[PDB]
Each structure stands twice: as C-alpha cells, then as structure tokens.
Subunit: 157 residues, 6 copies
C-alpha cells in the first residue's frame, strides 16, 4: 500500500514531467498527480484541460490517477492517506527553494519529499519556457506529449 | 565602539531572524535592526514585534529605514552589516549587493547561517503556511505568532 | 512489491543516515542498506553492519548487507531498481546528480534523493570522526551504541 | 567568417557588458549586440543603442541592432549560430544553462559564456540604476557617457 | 585568423569532449586540442594513445589539430599566437574552480576563457567516471567514441 | 571586549587573506590569526609572513594552532570565527563546519567575501602559477612574493 503524490501546476504537462510520473509509477504502488491551482491566477490552460492532457499521456500507467487541488500540498497528501511527495529536478529548478519547502512540509505534517532528476533529454524543458518559446514560434514539439503540442499552438493562435 | 546593522523587511520577524540578532548582539557592542520599507504588517507593527522579541538584548535597538542601506549604516557611525543565511537565501544576489555596498561606501557585510532548527522558515513561507492553516508556532516568537493569527482571523 | 537500496560507507552510521533509512523503510516495501567497501576506514565492514542493525532494530522491512563493485549490479541482482540517497550540508550534489544519470543510463536504475532533518544536516561520518578524535562531543549526532564504540576505537 | 550575437536589455550598458563585448570582438570576425525589447525600462531602445555605440567606438567588427521575438531567429537570420553571454555575480546561471540547451535544441545555436572581469563583476543594469536613484556613486562601473545620461534621467 | 585551445587530460577523450571540439571547430577558424600532461603522474593512457584516440574521432574536422603540453596552459595558448580557451561544462564540473582559473588566466596572460555546456546526452560522462564504471563492468560504450571503448577495455584487462 | 579568530593554513598568506584580516581588525576589538598545522612554508615562516604583512594592525596577533579550531577560539576567551570567501571556496563545506562548530562549542562563524581584485587568488593556485613562471606579484604582499621566489629558485 505504498504511494506518492507528484505535484505541480502542469500548465502544460511536459515530457520532463511524464518521465518523473513514469518513474514514480514504477516505484510506488499508487501515484496521484496533483494539479495544484491558484484560484487567484489563471494559467494558460483550465484545470480540466490540464487534467485531460495528463490523462491522455499516462494511459499506459494503471496505478496513476490525476486530481486537482489547492491550498497546502501536505493536506492533499495526508487526506489521501499518504505521506510522500515525489518531485522532479530539471535544469533551472530552484533546488534551494524546493529544499526549504521540503523541510517545511516535513515539519508541519511529517510528509517526506523524494527528488528525482528528469532524463537528460527532458532536462531543459519547463512549462514556462516551452510556452515562451512556442509563443515566438520555436519548435518545442519534441519536448511535449502529443496530448499537449497542438492544444498549445491553439491557445497561442 | 564596535557595531553592525541587521537589515530586512521582517514581515514578520521569525526565530531565524532572532537567532541572528542574538549572535550579532553577542559579538558587536551595538546592533541596529533596520526595518526596510505592501506587506502584511505595518512598519510600526514590525518594529514592535522585534522590540518585544529582543527585550533581553540591551545593546540592540530597532529603527525603520529608507533609501540606500549603506547610508542608513554610515549615518549611524557604523560600517558593518550582519546578514543571516537560511535555506532558500539567494546567496549570489547577497554577494553581489555585498560587493556593491563595499564599493560605494566601504561597508563590510558579514554573513552568518541561522540555526538548523530555524533554517527553513522565512517570513513569506511562514505567512503562506499559516494562511492555509499550517502550524508555524515553533518557528516564530510567541508574540508574533498570536499577532499573525490575528491578522488572518 | 516495491523496494530500494540505501548505499554508503557508513563509517560509522550517523543519525543523518538513520533518518533517511527510516523514511525509506516507511515508503518502500523492502529496503536494503548496502555497506560499500573500498581498497580503508575506522570500522570493519562487519562492525559497520552491526552498528546499522543495532540502530535499525525497529525497521523490520530493512536489512543490511555488504557490497562490492558496481552499485547498480548490487541493486539489480536483488530484483530492485531504485536507489535512495540522503542529502546533507556538504553533500556534493552535482556529483550525486552525475552518478544518478550514469546509473540510470547503464542499468535503468532510478535514484531518489531525500534531505535529512535539519538537526542531523551537518553531521557526516568523516566530520564526526574528526571532531571526536580531538575530543569534541558528537553524542547528539550519532546512535548511542555508535558513540560508545567510537570512543573505544579512539581510546 | 566567424561571428556571434551578444544579447541583452542593456538598460543601461555597463562596463561589465563592455568587457564581454570587447572579448567577443577580439575572438570573432563579426559581433552583433542585440538590444532586446519587452512589453518597459529606463532608456528607450534607441537611447540604449546610442550608448552602446558610444562605448564600442573602438570595435569596428561589432555592430548594434534592436531585436524582438525569438533570440535564435535573430541569430540565424543574420547567418550566425553562436551566442556569447557574460557571467557576473548574481547571474542566474542555472537559467542561462537551461536557455542555452533549449536554444541549441530548437535551432542548433551554440552559447559561449565568459565571466566579466572581477572589477565589473558586481555591477548590473538594475543594481546600478537602484544605487544611482538613491544617490550612490556608480561612475566607476559605467561608461562615462552612460553615467552622464543616467544622472539626466534621474534629475 | 580566429582560434581557440580546448584543454584537458583526455584520459580518455569522451563524447562529451568531442561535442565541445565540434562546436569550437564550427565557431573558430582553428582549434587546437591541448592534451595537458602531468609529468609526475601517469594516467591510464600514454600521451600518444590519448592523441591517437582524439585524432581518430576528429578526422572530419579539418581545422582541428591535437598537441600535447605541460606547465601553464596560458603559455601553450600564447606561444601559438592565440588568446582564447574553450572549455566544456558537464554535470559534476567544478564550475567555481573553472571560474577561479579563468580569472587567474586572464590576469596573468590576458587569455579569455569561453565555456560551453555539452549536449544533454553527453552531460553525465566524465573520463574518471567512465573509467570507474568500466572497471566494474558497466556499459559505457554509448558515451565514448569507437576509437576509445575497446582500447579502454583492453587496458582494464 | 569583542574578538574573532581568522583560521587557515596560509601557505603563504595572500592579499585575499590580508583583506579579510583588515576587515576583521576594523570590526572587532581583538583579532587572532590562527595558523593551523606538508606545505611549502614552515609554520614559523607562515607566521612571520603574516606578522610582516599585518604590522599596521595593532589589535591583530598571529599564533599557530593544533586540534579543534573551536578549542583554539574558546581557550582565548572568544567564540567567533571570521572566514573569508573567494572564488573556489567550498562554501557548502564551510557551512557544514560552521553548523558543527556552533553545535559543539557555541562558536559563531561570520563569512565575508574578499575584494573582487583578490577573489581568484588562493595559496595553492598562487604557488602553482608561480612554480611555472607566472607573475603573481599583484596578488601577494611584497614580502611574501620575494620569499616565494626564494623557495622556488
Ligand atoms: C521535472 C518536474 C518539474 N516539476 C514541477 C512541476 C510544476 O510546477 O509544474 C515536477 C513535478 C512533479 C514531477 C516532475 C517535475
Ligand atoms: C535569516 C535572515 C534572513 N534575512 C534576510 C531577510 C530579508 O532580507 O528580508 C536576514 C536579515 C538579517 C538577519 C537575519 C536574516
Ligand atoms: C545523509 C546520507 C549520506 N549518505 C551517503 C553517505 C556515505 O557514503 O556514507 C547517505 C546514504 C544513504 C542514505 C542517507 C545518506
Ligand atoms: C555581463 C553580462 C550580462 N549580460 C546579460 C545582461 C542583460 O540582459 O542586460 C550580458 C549579455 C551579453 C554580454 C555580457 C553580459
Ligand atoms: C566536457 C568537457 C570537460 N573538459 C575537461 C577536459 C579534461 O580535463 O579532460 C573539457 C575540455 C574541453 C572541452 C570540453 C570539455
Ligand atoms: C580568503 C580566505 C580564505 N580562507 C580560507 C583559507 C584556508 O582555509 O586555508 C580564509 C581564512 C581566513 C580569512 C580569509 C580567508
């Protein structure tokens, strides 16, 4: 009955994210992808769009499910009877801030955070940089799942 | 006649800040906490909370500041800054400012890491966690914590 | 059935190590602590294993074994393909990242990193030995049984 | 025929920037300084270009142009495929690395990094403006013509 | 008449090195790979072996040549009428030490150092880690040029 | 009665070290340079070179040390260390030692960055460059530089 939560805004999900989802699904009995929403700032994609893009690119992972949430991550985790977070690392990750949040999350709720580095091929993509590059016409098709790329181009046009 | 300035926004002051205040006060004759000024607490409130938390430090005082930090320091006859380091400190930016401050006014900056127990609190993260109901009472002075609860509720 | 290996020299095991062991044992069905030996330290391999077993008596899904050679072979030979490594102040994280990417490339093994608790974040096996050698008190940073043994090796 | 682009907002150009411009112009047959504009600063694009040209008068193989949109398009449209970026204290190097790897992936453009001289390592456009705003003397960190103009904008 | 020196011990050359050689050869009129030797510590490969492995994997680069040296890098550079170094970055590079050496080299000889990050695929290989992995039987064949791999296995057996 | 210890191997002392010595001496009543002990110069030689370079600092003295640094500090009635930062400093290890030293003996560590001009010299790199004929005369006290040339030639 092991389990972990993979949190993020996923606006949109990238292949860097999916790599980490796959590793978590391979190493824990259940994985919940937590799409965390700030109710005070809209992203590019609505919550239902974000979830649909993740579901479409994780259909081969039977022990992974996707849910949205807001507020404290550790409450989302604990209310599902879990106490582990799995977070990806990429080039440009603010690791010091991730460490700060991990120590805080352990302090307030006893939840552990496990970090895993994404594959080198996917290590320089981020949701924000992919959106920025695509906005100005750059080809990011190789860094995003098919469930995302043309939806992204659609939002931009 | 030694002295140092401990600058920050302190909105609110944390035990991380207080730990560094205490070390500065133990190692310099005179310490001034500089409250540099759209946050949660007003300047006077921040000052009050720091004074309340530092009552046991006879050689420490608290003042608000505006403009160049080095001017704040120099206009009080000093030329040392003591700055704390915590998890999530942008140290590269701190170093840039330290070299700039030395260049323009001959003021030295001394960095000291806060205690491990208080190394992951920041004013911003404490407010965020408290806003969503998390317990940060172990990370703030007793007075501050009650005051924070007040601003929220 | 999930599982991970926690590798190190553990010469001696510290409370920083133990914290990570505990978190691994809480999150994986099986944990193996791999005591890695090189061609050299203060404690023998058997002594190190003994100290880890004493400190992890409450962890029934964790076991301790010695290992030699390629870490990913150690992992895969036991039917696992995850490594859990702790992070502390002074960890060469860039080198850990290099090794993690290498280990994934050559054997498909994943590496999960977890930061030890702030209280145990500045202890290391090497620094504890150095401080103890010159009479510093590191008893709050080591398991009780380890601290006793350490004094013995030094006196 | 070799060449590189040196991109930035240069609002205003600093001696840190100039040092890197000089090194680029010494090592490549052609250098283009790309003054990048966003939807916002102290100096207009034309003012920035003017200040860079004043400061680089002795560099005949360097020219200054404004740019918008995708940096790698700016580079490739001028028949080049190298970027030269400076490093200073406070540079977000991890983000620079991310962008370099992205820029290589999407367009085949290489990025070369060079550290500015220690004397100019703590100036940035933003910090110079901030210090000057409150009356600090940054004249040793900026070209003479830039310092004069800066005082003007503030007074 | 532009030019740069690409320095290292190259014991052995890796695909991370070759990527940087290729980028330097594409951006400078001439590139000299400097095989720097400590006369007080032998590596795994002799200087002639190192040079031969580099030459064999750079035959498609007409403006690159390979030479060995010792002592101060900036003397090697300046005695060839050049004043640029091109150095690669990978995962595990001690960048702070590289920066220190770059500032020192500029101070004492006026030589500039340009850093370039190796491709993600080659970002976790190093000569030392490749030797270590191969020593204990791990497969590093995809991280080294053909001119190296079996020579490496030969040294190890 | 303020004071700090500046520890290192100083083999030899550089202008980077001296810059930090000067700042420590300007901000603390009493400074002790601790020469901690197979290098190029003997302990006495290192001490001599530092004394010669710090003659203008009346409140600074130089002593050799062995064993725990915190014992050196505490046995002199102090509990502050001042440590310089340069390009290539292993800051993560410095932080580990600082937290350890606070834990075992209540000694604080204050870090200060050396001036940009002296930020890329280290004892080791200065010796290496000088060994192969490079000019490091701008990076070392005049006395030290001549002494170094002597050891080489
Ligand atoms: C690579 C990576 C980034 N993040 C942050 C996610 C975000 O903020 O959108 C992750 C979260 C979970 C798993 C992997 C990752
Ligand atoms: C722990 C800590 C952080 N900071 C900066 C906080 C800020 O810049 O607002 C400090 C400033 C003075 C003393 C201690 C600290
Ligand atoms: C905190 C920590 C350090 N290391 C490596 C230390 C060593 O090599 O002995 C670990 C290995 C496994 C779990 C936790 C840790
Ligand atoms: C020192 C330095 C900073 N940057 C970016 C600064 C900016 O974005 O304005 C550079 C760009 C080109 C060459 C040198 C530099
Ligand atoms: C990736 C990389 C590492 N290094 C150090 C070389 C070494 O020390 O063997 C390089 C040197 C030149 C070009 C690229 C590289
Ligand atoms: C610049 C600098 C480096 N270090 C450490 C050198 C060492 O640890 O040997 C210092 C120690 C005291 C004062 C200044 C410095």
């Amino acid at each position: 009955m092991t389990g972990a939560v993979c949190p993020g805004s996923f606006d949109p999900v990238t292949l860097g994210h999916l790599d980490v989802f796959e590793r978590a699904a391979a190493q824990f009995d259940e994985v919940i992808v937590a799409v965390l929403i700030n109710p005070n700032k809209a992203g590019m994609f609505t919550v239902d769009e974000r979830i649909e893009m993740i579901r479409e690119s994780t259909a081969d992972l039977p022990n992974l499910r996707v849910e949205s949430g807001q507020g404290l991550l550790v409450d989302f985790v604990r209310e599902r009877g879990l106490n582990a977070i799995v977070k990806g690392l990429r080039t440009g990750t603010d690791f010091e801030y991730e460490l700060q949040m991990a120590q805080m999350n352990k302090h307030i709720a006893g939840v552990d955070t496990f970090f895993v580095a994404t594959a080198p091929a996917y290590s320089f993509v981020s949701s924000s940089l992919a959106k920025e590059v695509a906005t100005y016409g750059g080809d990011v098709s190789a860094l995003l799942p098919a469930s995302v790329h043309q939806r992204l181009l659609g939002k931009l046009r």
